[PDB]
Amino acid sequence: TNPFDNEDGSFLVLVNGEGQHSLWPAFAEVPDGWTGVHGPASRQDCLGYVEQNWTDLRPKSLIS
Amino acid sequence: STVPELLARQVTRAPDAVAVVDRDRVLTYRELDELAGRLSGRLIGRGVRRGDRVAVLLDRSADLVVTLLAIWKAGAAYVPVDAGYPAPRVAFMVADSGASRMVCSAATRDGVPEGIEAIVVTDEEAFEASAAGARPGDLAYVMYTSGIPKGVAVPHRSVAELAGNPGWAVEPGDAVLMHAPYAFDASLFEIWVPLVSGGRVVIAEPGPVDARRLREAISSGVTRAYLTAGSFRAVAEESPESFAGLREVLTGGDVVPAHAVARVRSACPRVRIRHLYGPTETTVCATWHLLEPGDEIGPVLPIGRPLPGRRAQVLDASLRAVAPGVIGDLYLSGAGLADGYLRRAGLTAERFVADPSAPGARMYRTGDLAQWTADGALLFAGRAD
């Protein structure tokens, strides 16, 4: 099963310098340039954090 | 960069070159620029501001190309709507996309939803020509892909990387046939690639392009044409000689069997055959496979190698890179990524994920399976589902 689609998987939410959010399987090392900000949690819980906390898809560089 | 910036170089270099040919209408590069400037002036005068979305409901025509460029000059992003969509689908796309104004023609005027400002492209207005100018981080278009259609928000930077890619190899003498719906991103090759290259866009006569219309288009000077996989397969098996005289035929989307390509090569030895692969989320195509004139396709048609400026990874369920000959999950990175899905941050964050090979970068999870060949091509291995 692809790790990003596993509804029973454990996931992180990551954020980069542009404010973009990413789901991430908790078993995998977080890539450079990304910071974990939520989890480990369920896939739906992680999606909820993103929906709540990512309010503008626009890159933070674009805004300023 | 932006396509308008790239387009501006061709207007400066060869202003009297042909840019767009419609049935009895021929627009030069300079004429196209001036028309787009006037319509842009109208948009600015109506209160259009940077980042606004403007829907477009037009049949393919010279007026269409002008409209897309005008929206870009006003700093806005166009939301392309096919005039043949049912009204509820049109209403949904306009509402989901956040478009407050919609450019139409007399013929399409009745398709503008109630409560949405209709802007009739052939109407004059008093506003002077004016352009705010496109910027690479600003949005360029929102194209919908499906259960329910979702809007893929693509920035100018990604459109220009695709349109200006040196691999297209489109030159000023080229003439590209335009018949794909502008609601689909194959239209980015048919419209913007030739215009950033100095060539001309040839608007196909109304109705589907069949083998006969293709032969006729070639006789009139068309040198490159994209067909959907279904259309390519039909013409290849029934009338493969109809591609004769093209410099390059392109195809992609649905599956294309190697047998279809071999039939074309046998009938048309000098035609370049290009297979395109990629989702709307990565602007038209992320990988491609080119069959040079005289060369014979193997038993399998690859999806090919990443375009210049792009990268692909094939990872296993642990996110580890696989060796050649191993089927894994295909991820696309580098140039051409969309910003994400409008109004859908969760979906963006699950499809557009952190890229372990590029600091701070994203990769798009295609949902397809692939394997590498020993020499760095990709073979499709089906959807993960």
Numbering used by the authors:
A (entry chain D): 2 to 65
B (entry chain A): 9 to 154, 158 to 396
Would you copy out the relevant sentences from the publication that reported this structure?
To understand the effects of the evolutionary mutations seen in the binding pocket of the ANC A-domains we then mutated the residues of the substrate binding pocket of A1tei to those seen in A1ANC2 and A1ANC3. Comparison of the A1ANC2 pocket with the A1tei/ANC1 Hpg pocket revealed that the amino acid substitutions contribute both to prevent Hpg binding and opening the pocket to accept proteinogenic amino acids instead of Hpg. The substitution H237Y is key in this process, as it removes H-bonding to the 4-hydroxyl group of Hpg and narrows the pocket to exclude the planar Hpg residue. The L295V mutation then opens a cavity that allows the binding of proteinogenic amino acids with a 109° angle at the β carbon. These two key substitutions (H237Y and L295V) enabled binding of new substrates and potentiated the binding pocket for subsequent refinement and partition of substrate binding mode. Activity of ANC2int is consistent with this being an intermediate pocket, showing reduced activity that is improved through natural selection, and supports Van-type GPAs as being older than Pek-type GPAs. No substrate bound structure was obtained for A1ANC2 and ANC4, with substrates shown in stippled lines and greyed out to show an approximate position of bound substrate. The ability to interrogate the stepwise changes in the GPA NRPS via mutation of A1 provides important insights into their evolutionary process, showing that the switch from Hpg (ANC1) to Leu (ANC3) did not result in an intermediate pocket (ANC2) capable of activating both residues. Instead, this was a direct selectivity switch that was subsequently refined to provide the modern Van-type GPA A1-domains.
Since ANC1-3 domains display polydisperse elution profiles in size exclusion chromatography, we instead turned to the characterisation of an Acore construct of the Hpg accepting A1 domain from Tei biosynthesis (A1tei), which possesses a homologous pocket to ANC1.
